[PDB]
Design an enzyme around this catalytic site. Structure first.
Site, mmCIF file in Angstrom:
data_model
loop_
_atom_site.group_PDB
_atom_site.id
_atom_site.type_symbol
_atom_site.label_atom_id
_atom_site.label_comp_id
_atom_site.label_asym_id
_atom_site.label_seq_id
_atom_site.Cartn_x
_atom_site.Cartn_y
_atom_site.Cartn_z
ATOM 1 C CB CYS A 1 93.995 -56.884 -3.292
ATOM 2 S SG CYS A 1 93.995 -56.097 -1.647
ATOM 3 N NE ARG B 1 97.807 -57.656 -4.600
ATOM 4 C CZ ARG B 1 98.329 -57.966 -5.805
ATOM 5 N NH1 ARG B 1 98.919 -59.152 -5.985
ATOM 6 N NH2 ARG B 1 98.214 -57.146 -6.858
ATOM 7 C CD1 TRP C 1 92.709 -49.765 5.473
ATOM 8 C CD2 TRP C 1 93.192 -51.407 6.991
ATOM 9 N NE1 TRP C 1 94.097 -50.024 5.440
ATOM 10 C CE2 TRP C 1 94.409 -50.994 6.369
ATOM 11 C CE3 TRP C 1 93.234 -52.411 7.957
ATOM 12 C CZ2 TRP C 1 95.655 -51.554 6.702
ATOM 13 C CZ3 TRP C 1 94.504 -53.002 8.306
ATOM 14 C CH2 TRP C 1 95.684 -52.564 7.672
ATOM 15 C CD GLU D 1 87.686 -50.300 -1.367
ATOM 16 O OE1 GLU D 1 88.488 -50.034 -0.385
ATOM 17 O OE2 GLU D 1 87.153 -51.434 -1.490
HETATM 18 C C1 HEM Z 1 94.118 -54.400 4.472
HETATM 19 C C2 HEM Z 1 93.425 -53.441 3.786
HETATM 20 C C3 HEM Z 1 92.986 -53.591 2.368
HETATM 21 C C4 HEM Z 1 92.799 -52.633 1.404
HETATM 22 C C5 HEM Z 1 92.989 -51.150 1.519
HETATM 23 C C6 HEM Z 1 92.346 -53.281 0.224
HETATM 24 C C7 HEM Z 1 92.084 -52.550 -0.958
HETATM 25 C C8 HEM Z 1 91.388 -53.163 -1.973
HETATM 26 C C9 HEM Z 1 90.745 -52.475 -3.034
HETATM 27 C C10 HEM Z 1 90.675 -50.971 -3.212
HETATM 28 C C11 HEM Z 1 90.225 -53.420 -3.866
HETATM 29 C C12 HEM Z 1 89.419 -53.172 -5.154
HETATM 30 C C13 HEM Z 1 87.958 -53.552 -4.896
HETATM 31 C C14 HEM Z 1 86.891 -52.845 -5.705
HETATM 32 O O1 HEM Z 1 87.190 -51.920 -6.508
HETATM 33 O O2 HEM Z 1 85.676 -53.197 -5.570
HETATM 34 C C15 HEM Z 1 90.547 -54.690 -3.294
HETATM 35 C C16 HEM Z 1 90.229 -55.884 -3.869
HETATM 36 C C17 HEM Z 1 90.482 -57.077 -3.241
HETATM 37 N N1 HEM Z 1 91.153 -57.288 -2.098
HETATM 38 FE FE1 HEM Z 1 91.794 -56.001 -0.885
HETATM 39 N N2 HEM Z 1 92.358 -54.555 0.404
HETATM 40 C C18 HEM Z 1 92.628 -54.842 1.693
HETATM 41 C C19 HEM Z 1 92.632 -56.070 2.390
HETATM 42 C C20 HEM Z 1 92.241 -57.296 1.808
HETATM 43 C C21 HEM Z 1 92.207 -58.536 2.494
HETATM 44 C C22 HEM Z 1 92.414 -58.754 3.989
HETATM 45 C C23 HEM Z 1 91.897 -59.489 1.534
HETATM 46 C C24 HEM Z 1 91.683 -60.927 1.713
HETATM 47 C C25 HEM Z 1 92.347 -61.643 2.622
HETATM 48 C C26 HEM Z 1 91.780 -58.819 0.290
HETATM 49 C C27 HEM Z 1 91.526 -59.432 -0.883
HETATM 50 C C28 HEM Z 1 91.066 -58.632 -1.909
HETATM 51 C C29 HEM Z 1 90.487 -59.310 -3.070
HETATM 52 C C30 HEM Z 1 90.286 -60.801 -3.268
HETATM 53 C C31 HEM Z 1 90.101 -58.340 -3.885
HETATM 54 C C32 HEM Z 1 89.448 -58.566 -5.212
HETATM 55 C C33 HEM Z 1 87.919 -58.525 -5.068
HETATM 56 C C34 HEM Z 1 87.231 -58.586 -6.431
HETATM 57 O O3 HEM Z 1 87.827 -59.030 -7.463
HETATM 58 O O4 HEM Z 1 86.045 -58.185 -6.523
HETATM 59 N N3 HEM Z 1 92.081 -57.527 0.448
HETATM 60 N N4 HEM Z 1 91.341 -54.549 -2.194
HETATM 61 N N1 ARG Z 2 89.147 -53.128 1.358
HETATM 62 C C1 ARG Z 2 88.510 -54.221 0.924
HETATM 63 N N2 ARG Z 2 88.575 -55.432 1.555
HETATM 64 N N3 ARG Z 2 87.775 -53.997 -0.175
HETATM 65 C C2 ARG Z 2 86.943 -54.931 -0.939
HETATM 66 C C3 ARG Z 2 86.027 -54.126 -1.879
HETATM 67 C C4 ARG Z 2 84.901 -53.314 -1.188
HETATM 68 C C5 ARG Z 2 84.054 -52.430 -2.134
HETATM 69 N N4 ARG Z 2 84.918 -51.654 -3.009
HETATM 70 C C6 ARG Z 2 83.215 -51.426 -1.372
HETATM 71 O O1 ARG Z 2 83.500 -50.221 -1.502
HETATM 72 O O2 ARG Z 2 82.258 -51.744 -0.638
#
Ligand code: HEM
Ligand code: ARG
Ligand code: HEM
Ligand code: ARG
Ligand code: ZN
Lengths: 402, 403
Positions: free
Chosen positions: B107, B110, B279, B284
């Site tokens: 992610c 973070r 968000w 993405e």
């Molecule tokens: C606050 C705004 C956030 C942004 C911009 C964001 C951004 C992203 C992005 C770009 C990815 C890559 C996903 C992909 O390529 O499909 C990701 C993965 C992830 N994020 Fe976030 N994230 C956010 C919030 C969160 C929150 C609130 C959580 C959980 C509490 C979270 C947990 C994760 C996890 C677990 C992944 C890995 C998902 C996977 O392995 O398929 N993120 N995040």
């Molecule tokens: N910002 C997040 N919580 N992202 C989780 C991955 C979502 C996914 N990449 C999508 O475009 O639909």
């Protein structure tokens, strides 16, 4: 348990069984993954030699003949008596091609079978090194119809110092450190520029001054040789539709010739063994010209293109990069100098992976280096899982000789 | 050097050592022989995961070794002792949820980890009630466009008794209808779940952008179908700031990315239904969802409108179109006042996060291939940052599909 490797775009699966033949170690363990990191006795030499002799005889399909056994005996006799051995020209040719084939970071390995190998093991001075290097350049450049080559200088020997080319490529632009912190030219070459000056080179003061070579015969101070400007083919950059782009006075050299890696073939080490193919356009357009710690021209270009520089979200950086890469392609094509774009290069690497799957049961590949630096997921390699490991013969990093 | 992974930033020339990785419980998939970093995919055992977790909790409120700490450990072992399992205090659940996010190597968002609304839904006892909690989550997180990070936690896995599961991979997803000609209308990534919604009585639409209903499963029951009320689902129509025809393509995306098929594991306890949302980062939508060849695949269409030469790779048509598609995503979201962050602002903020975590924890587990954006890679500072990837716990983990 062997690695299952999935292509996410096509849903297909392969299994890499070539990685089982890995006798060398990557930087990872099971508790942590270090993959994105850029840098890392006689019966043991003998076991690497037997193995390499085995690869070679298998390659010419003589995998058992008189020749094969007699050759293993030769190598055994030579190591037992002298602690080392020597390769036959044709083994050396085979080892170099195999080193390239095995190079996990190379996107251009579809080409691996077509490599001109210059045997320079009968080289005894910096002066001779230079002559050989000049031949290499002349051959590889070929008036812009680039051809892949390697020139292999004398192996390391337990006694003495190594032969080395101190430069990191045969052709590089000078980076002149300012007292006021900044750099004129290429910031990646400040240290080699400083080195040259102190072994007595007269500097220029341009952005694109071609460096001299520092060549070192064993246990001698390195010597300075200036490359004849007619050997160094260069491409002025212009843009196909933006007239102002040429005004930027950008240019780049034609020939990418890496000269600091160590070549290892059957336990033998070749500390000077410069190699060259041709550029993939993003190396020049994205990395060399747009890296912030390199020429870092993105802002200049964005301002000429009149872009809103004040905010990341106008994607000015992205728009400028694309035009810069386009300028590199256009200029190389106009000058009739071989180049490959990142789309054609990754498509051919996919074909390479497939060739390698059938022929060896896998291909070592370093995903972070195979995926190009712009437009990653727009290329098929982004969607392809990849397994990284070290096969031998190999190109390896070695310490800077100073 | 010290005896820990050395980590280099090649833009700035700076070094750090990851000491946090020595806290890693779980093996990743790499050995000394081969790197598998690019790949996308009980008794005393529980007790020691629990103990380790409770220790984490007490550290984070700085009461390690205190009497309240030793009493909670005792309470947790006794509860396991008689029931096979135990339960979290509310504030432990809140800590574990934030820490799972903070731990997530993939992610890039973070920097926001400390600001998570944790909806405790461990009292939930029916599929209908999951639906209400989910609707509440969506209304709260969406917040008319000013998005707020949130997670809703349903009851943990329990011995013998069936799981709570959301079948959908996100709370909001577009239908993928398999055509007669073998091609797909809508999102090809969603074909299976689309077909499943049909098998369970959903009357399918036929648009490119049909919002799926939810298929929600309470313990030991078949999943039930729930249609989100349209007005809870905020969507952004896409237009381009200068290419006027782009609006005429009728493309759109939803505002809220809410992953719903991951398992939240805290102290050995398993929360099989715990959807979370933040968000979007613009790539993405604009790069992966709209331009992946196996997704909407709109790159050629956009390039043709832009009058680009699509017969030759060397025109960079793919690159030019993709840029314009990302600019449209950014531009449209801003116009609609819906939170979104571009891949430059995101990666900068993630460098800042890495620096915070270096001081706070001595490292930060990061999966480079997923952190670097899918366009303009080396243009972002994360490209030049080496990263160490490992699994810490609490964790969000993949789990097999319920079917
Ligand atoms: C606050 C705004 C956030 C942004 C911009 C964001 C951004 C992203 C992005 C770009 C990815 C890559 C996903 C992909 O390529 O499909 C990701 C993965 C992830 N994020 Fe976030 N994230 C956010 C919030 C969160 C929150 C609130 C959580 C959980 C509490 C979270 C947990 C994760 C996890 C677990 C992944 C890995 C998902 C996977 O392995 O398929 N993120 N995040
Ligand atoms: N910002 C997040 N919580 N992202 C989780 C991955 C979502 C996914 N990449 C999508 O475009 O639909
Ligand atoms: C024929 C045209 C070729 C192309 C287009 C090409 C392309 C590339 C590219 C893009 C890289 C990544 C390098 C970087 O980002 O700095 C690379 C790495 C490399 N290639 Fe090639 N390559 C070619 C020929 C060759 C040849 C002839 C050899 C040697 C026989 C070779 C061996 C390597 C090695 C060893 C690396 C790793 C360099 C390092 O670790 O810094 N390649 N190649
Ligand atoms: N095409 C090759 N053989 N490349 C090796 C690396 C050259 C390096 N990327 C450069 O920008 O100069
Ligand atoms: Zn690894």
């Amino acid at each position: 348990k062997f690695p299952r490797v999935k292509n996410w775009e096509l849903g297909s699966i392969t299994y890499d069984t070539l990685c089982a033949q890995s006798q060398q170690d990557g930087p990872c363990t099971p508790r942590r993954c270090l993959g994105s990191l850029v840098l890392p006795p006689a019966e043991q030499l003998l076991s690497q030699a037997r193995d390499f002799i085995n690869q070679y005889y298998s390659s010419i399909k003589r995998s058992g003949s008189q020749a094969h056994e007699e050759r293993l005996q030769e190598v055994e006799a030579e190591v037992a008596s002298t602690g080392t051995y020597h390769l036959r020209e044709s083994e050396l040719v085979f080892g170099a091609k195999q080193a390239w084939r095995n190079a996990p970071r190379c996107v251009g390995r579809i080409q691996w079978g077509k490599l001109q190998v210059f045997d320079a093991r009968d080289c005894s001075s910096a002066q001779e090194m230079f002559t050989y290097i000049c031949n290499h350049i002349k051959y590889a450049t070929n008036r812009g119809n680039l051809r892949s080559a390697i020139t292999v200088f004398p192996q390391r020997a337990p006694g003495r110092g190594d032969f080395r080319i101190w430069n990191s490529q045969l052709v590089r632009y000078a980076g002149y450190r300012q007292q006021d912190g900044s750099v004129r030219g290429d910031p990646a070459n400040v240290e080699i520029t400083e080195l040259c000056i102190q072994h007595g080179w007269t500097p220029g003061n341009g952005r694109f001054d071609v460096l001299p070579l520092l060549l070192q015969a064993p246990d001698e101070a390195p010597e300075l040789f200036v490359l004849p400007p007619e050997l160094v083919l260069e491409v002025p950059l212009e843009h196909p539709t933006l007239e102002w782009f040429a005004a930027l006075g950008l240019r780049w050299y034609a020939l990418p010739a890496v000269s600091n890696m160590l070549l290892e073939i059957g336990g033998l080490e070749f500390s000077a063994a410069p190699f060259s193919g041709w550029y993939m356009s993003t190396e020049i357009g994205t990395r060399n010209l747009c890296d912030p710690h390199r020429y870092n021209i993105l802002e200049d270009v964005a301002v000429c293109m009149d872009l809103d520089t004040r905010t990341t979200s106008s994607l000015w950086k992205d728009k400028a990069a694309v035009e810069i890469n386009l300028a590199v392609l256009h200029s190389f094509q106009l000058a009739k100098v071989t180049i490959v774009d990142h789309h054609a290069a990754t498509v051919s690497f996919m074909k390479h992976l497939d060739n390698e799957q059938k022929a060896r049961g896998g291909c070592p590949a370093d995903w972070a280096w195979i995926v190009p630096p712009i437009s990653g997921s727009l290329t098929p390699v982004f969607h392809q899982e990849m397994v990284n490991y070290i096969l031998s013969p190999a190109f390896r990093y070695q310490p800077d000789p100073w």
